[PDB]
């Protein structure tokens, strides 16, 4: 029966491949040839946020476009005011090995996690004045790779194990679990409407999940190695994935297949973080050679470079209003570019 | 009020400066091993669903934080990159011959990884007593898994522990040389491997780690001071 089931899976996968090939009447480049190029995109380092003692593993902008949280592997996550460079908060962490951090869309809480397998939720609006752990979500059997708030009470977290989970912060229990990946889930991206989210894992595949129902709607392949980063296109109908194979890839949810691949011959290093500009016309990707590349998302020609960092660029985020790009690195500096 | 904001920023910067001394003083170590390796016994030796366990100990008034991964999957290519700035990796191996090839492959992967390439490794060839017992038993043959052992002979300048049977010396130094060959095959001398023969009853493992970390710090300082 194992052979029969494998043959059935092969037949279904061939059917999916044939449907995708049929739907691929044209390539994105063939259609984007009609539009003029974005030109040279030169961005200057407006701010350099110093204060972290070790690598910055993650960062996240606040929805207000001013305050941003950054987590470092020295056991500290700092909430900065980017406009003035002041540090609003410096929360010490129970576990030094933090791999992710999130800022609540309401600005009231922050979240972090890492090799401790626990997602700590900190309340910034505490009456006592000093930020204290509001909750500690446990239940993952592997290191926490990413986490994102849906509201003040719900949070989606991807784990080193092959599953994601949507939690209820008030109760601290996994409201639902998302299974189907075969490797570590490395990245996570909430859709603009928060109804769906895409997760890229340590395999060729990235999966789309419906937070309500709790199953994988679609699986997209094409990458040759781990998907280290993932980000949703601003309109929510597509997403970009950066992988260890040194290439970015733009997939479309409706076409259910790869739409474009961004790569260059001399780029032989992995991609750590990707994000889209407000319009979506630019795709910014951080690399292991510690310089970010700004790609024309439509024409897929490198439009610019951000080469201010001295060690691996580990995190990269564009503001909600699109006024700046904050890049963190293993040199323990966050740089705002504009 | 911007003035209150700057005051809070100054307070936070003072806290960060205060804790920077603690961060710099402490030395961080990553304990790696397999199920058969007695890394847990090494942890318990030091008398001063969690994903990682930390042990604080002190030697000669310097503080060591040793981290041992707990509930993690076998695939380690991603969560190991977190330890690219530790002072050292204490690699514990079950030297009683067989999973020795597996341990050698793990050591090779650790050595040649792009992010651990500058991290020195303290190699504890643990469980030496079991190796001695089974080498003297004669039922198991190292040449079965490592045919080169059929030709290897202990170097003329060996330093066997007095009273040790030459067969045990040959086997232990053969395994040590197997690890050292991988260590020296690459790295261009920016990171070093420190092989040690340890046991479960040993009480000087902390001293070994302290001395090896002293040498690692000496090399770091010598490199930054342009002397190397």
């Amino acid at each position, epitope marked *: 029966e194992l052979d029969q089931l*494998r043959q059935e899976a092969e037949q279904l996968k061939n059917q999916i491949r044939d449907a995708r090939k049929a739907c691929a009447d044209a390539t994105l480049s063939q259609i984007t040839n009609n539009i003029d190029p974005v030109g040279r995109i030169q961005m200057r380092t407006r701010r350099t946020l110093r204060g972290h003692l070790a690598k910055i593993y993650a960062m996240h902008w606040g929805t207000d476009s001013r305050l941003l949280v950054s987590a470092s592997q020295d056991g500290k996550l700092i909430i900065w005011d980017s406009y003035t460079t002041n540090k609003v908060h410096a929360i010490p962490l129970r576990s030094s090995w933090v791999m992710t951090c999130a800022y609540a869309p309401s600005g009231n809480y922050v979240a972090c996690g890492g090799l401790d397998n626990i997602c700590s939720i900190y309340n910034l609006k505490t009456r006592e004045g000093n930020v204290r752990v509001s909750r500690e979500l446990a239940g993952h059997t592997g290191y926490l790779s990413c986490c994102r708030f849906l509201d003040d009470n719900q949070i989606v977290t991807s784990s080193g194990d*092959t599953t994601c989970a949507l939690w209820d912060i008030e109760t601290g229990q996994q409201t639902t679990t998302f299974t189907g990946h*075969t*490797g570590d889930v490395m990245s996570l991206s909430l859709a603009p409407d928060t109804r769906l989210f895409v997760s890229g894992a*340590c*395999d*060729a*595949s990235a999966k789309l999940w419906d937070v309500r129902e709790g199953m994988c709607r679609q699986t997209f*392949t*094409g990458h*040759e*190695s*781990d998907i280290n980063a993932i980000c949703f296109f601003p309109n929510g109908n597509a997403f970009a994935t950066g992988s*260890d*194979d*040194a290439t970015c890839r733009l997939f479309d949810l409706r076409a259910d297949q790869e739409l474009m691949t961004y790569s260059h011959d001399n780029i*032989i290093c*992995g991609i750590t973080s990707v994000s889209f500009s407000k319009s979506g016309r630019l795709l910014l990707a951080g690399y292991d050679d510690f310089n970010c590349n700004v790609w024309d998302a439509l024409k897929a020609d490198r439009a610019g470079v951000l080469a201010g960092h001295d060690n691996r660029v580990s995190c990269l985020g564009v503001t909600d209003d699109g006024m700046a790009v904050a890049t963190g690195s293993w040199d323990s500096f966050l740089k705002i570019w504009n | 009020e911007d003035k209150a904001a700057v005051e809070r920023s100054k307070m936070i910067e003072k806290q960060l400066q205060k804790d920077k001394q603690v961060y710099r003083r402490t030395l961080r170590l990553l304990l790696l091993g397999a199920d058969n390796s007695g890394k847990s016994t090494i942890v318990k030796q030091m008398r001063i669903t969690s994903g990682i366990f930390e042990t604080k100990f002190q030697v000669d008034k310097v503080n060591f934080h040793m981290f041992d991964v707990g509930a993690q*999957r*076998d*695939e*380690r*290519r991603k969560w*190991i990159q977190c330890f690219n700035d530790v002072t050292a990796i204490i690699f514990v191996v079950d030297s009683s011959d067989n999973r020795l*090839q*597996e341990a050698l*492959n793990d050591f*090779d*992967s650790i050595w*040649n*990884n*792009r992010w651990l390439r500058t991290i020195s490794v303290i190699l504890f060839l643990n469980k030496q007593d079991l190796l001695a017992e089974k080498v003297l038993a004669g039922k198991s043959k190292i040449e*079965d*898994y*490592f*045919p*080169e052992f059929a030709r290897y002979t202990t170097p003329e300048d060996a330093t066997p522990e007095p009273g040790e049977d030459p067969r045990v010396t040959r086997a232990k130094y053969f395994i040590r040389k197997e690890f050292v060959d991988i260590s020296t095959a*690459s790295g261009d001398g920016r990171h070093i491997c420190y092989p040690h023969f340890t046991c479960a009853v040993d009480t000087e493992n902390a001293r070994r780690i302290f001395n090896d970390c002293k040498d690692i710090i000496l090399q770091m300082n010598l490199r930054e001071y342009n002397l190397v």
Partner: nanobody
Amino acid sequence: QVQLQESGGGLVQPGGSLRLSCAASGFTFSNYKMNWVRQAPGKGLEWVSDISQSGASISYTGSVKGRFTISRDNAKNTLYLQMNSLKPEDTAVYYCARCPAPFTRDCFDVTSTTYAYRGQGTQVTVS
């Protein structure tokens, strides 16, 4: 998708010789180091052989050194293991594993219980 299909292997008498072949698709075969691993009945996954991108450097587990020969064909995107003088211990399921990342010298997770870049394998049985 990244796929590896081991096209070879089967029953054999002790002391015989087989040739295992794996066809690799979905990725640039030349950029990745390749490895042969095997799982024997009642045992864990065991690393057998390794060959680099260009085939210049090769390595074997001591138990098979001198008996197995690993080779690579970038033009055909194929990995071969010519096995000679097969002992009864060689009976196992043989998988062709790929290095996790291209251009890298480390092969961390090829021998893991669950690995995303390993083929379904082929059974080799020795009478």
